[PDB]
Design an enzyme around this catalytic site. Structure first.
Site, PDB file in Angstrom:
ATOM      1  N   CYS A 183       8.588  -6.906  -8.050  1.00 18.68           N
ATOM      2  CA  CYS A 183       9.037  -6.088  -9.159  1.00 18.68           C
ATOM      3  C   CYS A 183      10.206  -5.249  -8.683  1.00 18.68           C
ATOM      4  CB  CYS A 183       7.919  -5.186  -9.679  1.00 18.68           C
ATOM      5  SG  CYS A 183       8.468  -3.937 -10.840  1.00 18.68           S
TER       6      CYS A 183
ATOM      7  N   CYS B 144      -0.789   2.414   9.213  1.00 19.09           N
ATOM      8  CA  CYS B 144      -0.480   0.998   9.267  1.00 19.09           C
ATOM      9  C   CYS B 144       0.684   0.787  10.214  1.00 19.09           C
ATOM     10  CB  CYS B 144      -0.121   0.496   7.904  1.00 19.09           C
ATOM     11  SG  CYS B 144       0.628  -1.187   7.678  1.00 19.09           S
ATOM     12  N   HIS B 145       0.706  -0.388  10.844  1.00 22.32           N
ATOM     13  CA  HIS B 145       1.782  -0.702  11.773  1.00 22.32           C
ATOM     14  C   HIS B 145       3.141  -0.609  11.098  1.00 22.32           C
ATOM     15  CE1 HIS B 145      -0.610  -2.159  15.269  1.00 22.32           C
ATOM     16  NE2 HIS B 145      -1.532  -2.304  14.333  1.00 22.32           N
ATOM     17  N   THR B 146       3.183  -0.815   9.785  1.00 14.58           N
ATOM     18  CA  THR B 146       4.443  -0.667   9.060  1.00 14.58           C
ATOM     19  C   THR B 146       4.953   0.766   9.088  1.00 14.58           C
ATOM     20  OG1 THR B 146       4.083  -2.577   7.653  1.00 14.58           O
ATOM     21  CG2 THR B 146       5.454  -0.774   6.781  1.00 14.58           C
TER      22      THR B 146
ATOM     23  N   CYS C 243       5.987  -3.260 -13.029  1.00 12.68           N
ATOM     24  CA  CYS C 243       6.461  -2.608 -14.254  1.00 12.68           C
ATOM     25  C   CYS C 243       6.164  -3.432 -15.499  1.00 12.68           C
ATOM     26  CB  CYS C 243       7.964  -2.295 -14.174  1.00 12.68           C
ATOM     27  SG  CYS C 243       9.140  -3.690 -14.453  1.00 12.68           S
TER      28      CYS C 243
ATOM     29  N   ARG D  87      -8.282  -0.050  11.695  1.00 16.84           N
ATOM     30  CA  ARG D  87      -7.747   0.974  10.801  1.00 16.84           C
ATOM     31  C   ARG D  87      -8.359   2.319  11.153  1.00 16.84           C
ATOM     32  NH1 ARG D  87      -3.990  -1.615   9.658  1.00 16.84           N
ATOM     33  NH2 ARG D  87      -2.988  -1.897   7.615  1.00 16.84           N
TER      34      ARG D  87
ATOM     35  N   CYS E 282      -2.726  -1.973   0.995  1.00 16.27           N
ATOM     36  CA  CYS E 282      -1.811  -2.794   1.800  1.00 16.27           C
ATOM     37  C   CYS E 282      -2.446  -3.905   2.647  1.00 16.27           C
ATOM     38  CB  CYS E 282      -0.981  -1.920   2.730  1.00 16.27           C
ATOM     39  SG  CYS E 282       0.268  -2.885   3.665  1.00 16.27           S
TER      40      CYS E 282
ATOM     41  N   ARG F 262      13.072  -0.164  -7.064  1.00 16.61           N
ATOM     42  CA  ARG F 262      13.551  -0.452  -5.715  1.00 16.61           C
ATOM     43  C   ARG F 262      14.828   0.331  -5.377  1.00 16.61           C
ATOM     44  NH1 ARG F 262      12.410  -1.710  -0.589  1.00 16.61           N
ATOM     45  NH2 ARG F 262      14.459  -1.965   0.429  1.00 16.61           N
TER      46      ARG F 262
ATOM     47  N   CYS G 231      10.518  -6.177 -16.026  1.00 15.97           N
ATOM     48  CA  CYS G 231      11.756  -6.617 -15.390  1.00 15.97           C
ATOM     49  C   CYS G 231      11.800  -8.138 -15.323  1.00 15.97           C
ATOM     50  CB  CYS G 231      11.908  -5.998 -13.997  1.00 15.97           C
ATOM     51  SG  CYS G 231      10.746  -6.668 -12.732  1.00 15.97           S
TER      52      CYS G 231
ATOM     53  N   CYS H  94       8.879  -9.402 -13.004  1.00 18.37           N
ATOM     54  CA  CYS H  94       7.583  -9.271 -13.669  1.00 18.37           C
ATOM     55  C   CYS H  94       7.457 -10.249 -14.833  1.00 18.37           C
ATOM     56  CB  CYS H  94       7.387  -7.838 -14.160  1.00 18.37           C
ATOM     57  SG  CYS H  94       6.984  -6.662 -12.866  1.00 18.37           S
TER      58      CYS H  94
ATOM     59  N   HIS I  83       1.584   4.858   3.499  1.00 21.54           N
ATOM     60  CA  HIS I  83       1.523   4.108   2.247  1.00 21.54           C
ATOM     61  C   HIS I  83       0.156   3.505   1.930  1.00 21.54           C
ATOM     62  CE1 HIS I  83       2.431   1.463   5.581  1.00 21.54           C
ATOM     63  NE2 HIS I  83       1.847   0.511   4.884  1.00 21.54           N
ATOM     64  N   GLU I  84      -0.879   3.705   2.748  1.00 23.70           N
ATOM     65  CA  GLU I  84      -2.237   3.272   2.405  1.00 23.70           C
ATOM     66  C   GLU I  84      -3.020   4.532   2.066  1.00 23.70           C
ATOM     67  OE1 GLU I  84      -4.140   0.899   5.372  1.00 23.70           O
ATOM     68  OE2 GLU I  84      -2.706  -0.731   5.184  1.00 23.70           O
TER      69      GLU I  84
END
Ligand code: ZN
Ligand code: ZN
Ligand code: ZN
Ligand code: ZN
Lengths: 378, 378
Positions: free
Chosen positions: A112, A46-48, A98, A371, A176, A116, A101, A104, A68-69
């Site tokens: 969430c 991904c570009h991220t 979660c 992708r 994502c 973090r 929190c 959430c 992350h994908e």
């Protein structure tokens, strides 16, 4: 028999920004309380991932394992994990859920904050350390997921348990890009049937916005890109009109207003260019048009407009992961996929192996690449 | 018996920007088709009148008769006018409600496009001319209302017919500032009971935001103003916490976020300062906070922020006349006033005469002045 033991496996390590990734044998530690170790079978770029690799992120921590994908199968779980177990088919997600929190429990957002304070700095909550090392040196996690690897360790609040018959080399996209675009339409904007929509940037995310708008019943779905070949690819995703800014002397927002007698009802910015974010707002119809920022801008860049745009009724907002709750709704998106109710396959234009990941990075500068999916076995 | 005749009366003429207003004997032509001539009995001063008298309006439409907050009695109507007749008590509105244009028929906005192409350039729709002159020299209208006069001519789609027993020296304020503030809360933001809100600027408009928020059931109502003397007045209108940005080394948005453990549910900018507009957005709670621009910035000034503010859940919008539909809802506001359900009297701190209008302009620099109401009889 790997339970409770370090696993040695292949991973692509980013030792420093803007340099080729290195395939290494890395050590992956066992999961601690509230953690899940996942055998990753397929992962997409991904570009991220490239944002941080390309040194554009001042918060970039190196060396790291990006990605992350992805989709895979739980290998083991840590103390107190009950929602998944070894053998479950799963999608790890950057966005945790979660359910306990302030965010959430607010009922007002899909954000969430549970993990973090660790995942934002490349470590784990339970011991404030990393589960990855290579040649005796620790490596940072990335986005709480780190999927450019045969095995990863994630927090349980970020693991979606999915239909075990769904093909894992397809549904890795549902962590994502595709949910971000679909949910920008269905959750953030809440686009009504008959709406006129403009989409700036016809990459993966813009095409998922187009699919979301089409599914919701939008009338005109106008794509804006400087590469007209992207329009031909976009047609099957629902884009049914196209404007190339280079064909006009007037600024693009004025061209759109002229074309729609006043502007669109919704616009979506899917590039991360702040100058295009301004154009997307200004092409919205006076009195009610809404512009949704979907793309992620580079550090320090600012959006700008004259406030009379908002005083005369346009609305500026944005979306994170399309407003979806990951653990609850990612399995629902897998269900819809299996029912042919959402597109996934058509986004996958290239299939490579993890060992060829640097070639995948090169494909990010190819307009015909949407992708690229990587098989982690080779 | 003035119907169909030219009326000679007193009016305050602005001949040049930044020069004193001149009390003149002016001629007021009779109303043409779709027009209404109104004997103005009381008119109030608004910052927007001085904003234009001072050159922050780039149009330079001088000489002109300013003024747009007023109340009075219809003197005569032109051909085709049915909703009002001579003798009716009325409030002219700078925001028309024709009920027939694309904006009125949309059900999505209170903006109306019927007459703006004329009222925005200081003339009438029917013949594209003015109804005002002084000794042969034509005078521009202002905002479709021009109420710094004993008589004015407005479009019938801009005339609200009100309860004849309501006191005209009080309800003239329902032509702009008070409904702007109240409706920012009730219509644009739609503030829910229990909400925490921040209000930037504690003049008339911001105090009306506080009253609106108090009526809607907001919990914390935080006033922000660089003049700490305004807090004592603001308490009377529902503000229950106060921050002066001059007392803090940190940008005010970060102070507010620390004070509310995350930010407010709604914020309102009531000054017209683009730097404060940015602060109002950035003090909204992550995930759901919404900021409403109420004040009017000077031509060319731009608002700015980093797009992650919107990606992570904040919403930027703005309001015109509080989102109220003028002909339909200004009479309803008058009814609320007569039933003691909204405050109006309390905003009036000074009463003067139209002949003293230059003295009143100086009061717009006084913090202790909220609204000055002028008696047009002398
Ligand atoms: Zn949570
Ligand atoms: Zn991504
Ligand atoms: Zn209208
Ligand atoms: Zn005003």
């Amino acid at each position: 028999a790997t339970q409770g033991q370090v696993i040695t496996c292949k991973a692509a390590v980013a030792y420093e920004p803007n340099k080729p990734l290195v395939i290494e044998d890395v050590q992956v530690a066992p999961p601690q309380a509230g953690e899940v170790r996942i055998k990753i079978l397929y992962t997409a770029l991904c570009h991220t991932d490239a944002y941080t690799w390309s040194g554009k992120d001042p918060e970039g921590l190196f060396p790291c394992i990006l990605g992350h994908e992805a989709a895979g199968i739980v290998e083991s779980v840590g103390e107190g994990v009950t929602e998944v177990q070894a053998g479950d088919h799963v999608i790890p997600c950057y966005q945790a859920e979660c359910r306990e929190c302030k965010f959430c429990k607010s009922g007002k957002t899909n954000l969430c904050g549970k993990v973090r304070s660790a995942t934002g700095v490349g470590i784990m909550m339970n011991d404030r350390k990393s589960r990855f090392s290579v040649n005796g040196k620790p490596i940072y996690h990335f986005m709480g997921t780190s999927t450019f690897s045969q095995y990863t360790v994630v927090h349980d609040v970020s693991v979606a348990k999915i239909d075990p018959t769904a093909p894992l080399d397809k549904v890795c996209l549902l962590g994502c890009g595709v949910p971000t675009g679909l949910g920008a339409v269905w959750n953030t904007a809440k686009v009504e049937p008959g709406s006129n929509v403009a989409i700036f940037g016809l990459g993966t995310v813009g095409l998922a916005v187009a699919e979301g708008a089409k599914t919701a019943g939008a009338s005109r779905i106008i794509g804006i890109d400087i590469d007209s070949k992207k329009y031909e690819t976009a047609k099957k995703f629902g884009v049914n009109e196209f404007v190339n800014p280079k064909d006009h002397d007037k600024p693009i927002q004025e061209v759109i207003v002229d074309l729609t007698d006043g502007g669109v009802d919704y616009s979506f910015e899917c590039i991360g260019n702040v100058s295009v974010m301004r154009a997307a707002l200004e092409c919205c119809h006076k009195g009610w048009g809404t512009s949704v920022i979907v793309g992620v801008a580079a550090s320090g860049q600012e959006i700008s407009t004259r406030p009379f745009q908002l005083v005369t009724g346009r609305v500026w907002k944005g979306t994170a992961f399309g407003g979806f709750k990951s653990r609850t709704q990612v399995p629902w998106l897998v269900e819809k996929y299996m029912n042919k109710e959402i597109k996934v396959d058509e986004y996958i234009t290239h299939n490579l192996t993890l060992g060829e990941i640097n070639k995948a990075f090169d494909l990010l500068h190819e307009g015909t690449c949407l992708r690229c999916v990587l098989d982690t076995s080779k």
